[PDB]
Design a protein around this ligand. Structure first.
Ligand SMILES: [Cl-]
Ligand SMILES: [K+]
Ligand SMILES: [K+]
Length: 52
DNA sequence: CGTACGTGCGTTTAAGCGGTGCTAGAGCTGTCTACGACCAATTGAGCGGCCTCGGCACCGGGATGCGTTTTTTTTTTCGCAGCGGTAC
């Protein structure tokens, strides 16, 4: 019943959920692994901080 | 005006070739596992309205430093007449 947001499970502020959707609806591939969005929201957050 | 390329002829090298010998590693087949797509339902994260108050652009009014001229000086750099010692 209690739904923790994946972004929390990675300790990322970047939305690992919205990254997963954007990828599947991006037409990048047929199938997205479940680590991929994590890995990507991570890298995104990181470069966001590096500039900020 | 100075010099560092360019040509070319002469030595040094090692690339290229064709063939031979050994073996990693490419790249396929079959099997089976784990992982991810799909669905449904349930949520709260995230978005479009409101309503401040404070960070920012502004403004005018001196203050610091930066460039221009042009005035006064310091240092160097010839040139003319006015010396002190030779010479006799
Ligand atoms: Cl993955
Ligand atoms: K091979
Ligand atoms: K597998």
């Amino acid at each position: 019943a209690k739904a923790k947001t994946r972004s929390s499970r990675a300790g990322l502020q970047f939305p690992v959920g919205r990254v997963h959707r954007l990828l599947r609806k991006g037409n990048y591939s047929e199938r997205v692994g479940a680590g991929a969005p994590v890995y990507l929201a991570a890298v995104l957050e990181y470069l966001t901080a590096e500039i900020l």
